[PDB]
């Protein structure tokens, strides 16, 4: 098991990273020097850097996920999360469009679905209503100061989110959120916490009763958001692959991106964090290389994805992991 995951060893926190610098958008660099600059720069409990843990050093290797799971303290749920979609694009091409040159209806159908969203619009969505609930606790020392804040806004803006459910993923965030009740960080109070994004990109068919053509060209009716919130239900992800249109293509379950919390008032160039598989340095894998990928990137990408969701989480206000600005590279 040449292809077995193994755990990067301990860094030293004394030790610096090696200089990389961004090519046309993204960086990276392997998992070991991740590490190291990690250890200086997002390491903080209260203002004081410290290592890896061996268990954080164990999450980080699973991949495309591993950023995320040990920034945010827990394997992504993905409960509270958002997108754009645009249903009128989505119906006129449908039915006043065009399929190509030997393109089935499925096929045509999938696709039009995949490119009616908008990722860009998508984002900021997540990142105004994270404001919201940021501003929503600031000084609220309990959860219903919160709640009442938090709802006074939705309110204010005549956001659909306001109608919610109390019990919904997006009421439910916050004492859903580990780290809340925590002594340690946290502690029950609001006030003690961030809003965090990060994003996943995933495939739209996963159904083992699927017709075929689902698995292959995506499913145009999972997964959709709804129009007034944009909130997509992620309780259908099953982290199941695209399956093969030939035989040359192979596909990945899916990826994921760490943004954080930047204060960078251009989407453009936030930075989004990822591995790009799990870490196999003895095997044909290789090693896992980490990319801070400027967002322009990050939404791109693959053919693997056709759908992208961009979630809500909350972390202590004390940790580091989601500062105000992250650079890429080294320095």
Not at 85 to 92: A, C, G, L, S
Not at 97 to 114: C, L, M, Q
Not at 132 to 159: C, F, P
Not at 227 to 240: A, H, K, Q, W
Request: charge should be neutral; charged fraction near 30%; hydrophobic fraction near 25%.
């Amino acid at each position: 098991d040449s292809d077995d995951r193994v755990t990067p060893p301990a860094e030293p926190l004394d030790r610096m990273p090696d200089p990389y610098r961004p090519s046309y958008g993204r960086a990276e660099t392997v998992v070991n020097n991740y590490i190291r600059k990690w250890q200086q720069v997002y390491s903080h409990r209260d203002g004081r850097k410290q290592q890896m843990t061996e268990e954080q050093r164990e999450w980080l290797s699973y991949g495309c996920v591993g950023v995320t799971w040990v920034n945010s303290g827990q394997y992504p749920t993905n409960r509270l999360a958002f997108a754009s979609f645009d249903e009128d694009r989505f119906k006129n091409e449908l039915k006043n469009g065009r399929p190509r040159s030997g393109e089935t209806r499925a096929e045509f159908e999938g696709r039009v679905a995949k490119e009616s969203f908008d990722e860009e619009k998508g984002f900021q969505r997540a990142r105004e209503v994270a404001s919201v609930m940021n501003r929503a606790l600031e000084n609220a020392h309990d959860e219903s100061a919160y709640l009442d804040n938090l709802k006074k806004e939705l309110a204010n803006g005549n956001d659909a989110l306001r109608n919610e459910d109390a019990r919904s993923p997006f009421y439910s965030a916050l004492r859903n959120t580990p780290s809340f009740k925590e002594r340690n960080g946290g502690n029950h109070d609001p006030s003690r916490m961030k809003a965090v994004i990060y994003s996943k990109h995933f495939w739209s068919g996963q159904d083992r009763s699927s017709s075929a053509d689902k698995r292959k060209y995506g499913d145009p009716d999972a997964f959709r958001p709804a129009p007034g919130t944009g909130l997509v239900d992620m309780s259908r992800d099953r982290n199941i692959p695209r399956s093969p249109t030939s035989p040359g293509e192979g596909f990945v379950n899916f990826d994921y991106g760490w943004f954080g919390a930047q204060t960078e008032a251009d989407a453009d160039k936030t930075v989004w964090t990822h591995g790009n598989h799990y870490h196999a340095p003895n095997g044909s894998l290789g090693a896992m290389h980490v990319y801070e990928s400027k967002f322009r990137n990050w939404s791109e990408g693959y053919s693997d994805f056709d759908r992208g969701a961009y979630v809500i989480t909350f972390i202590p206000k004390s940790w580091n992991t989601a500062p105000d600005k992250v650079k890429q590279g080294w320095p």
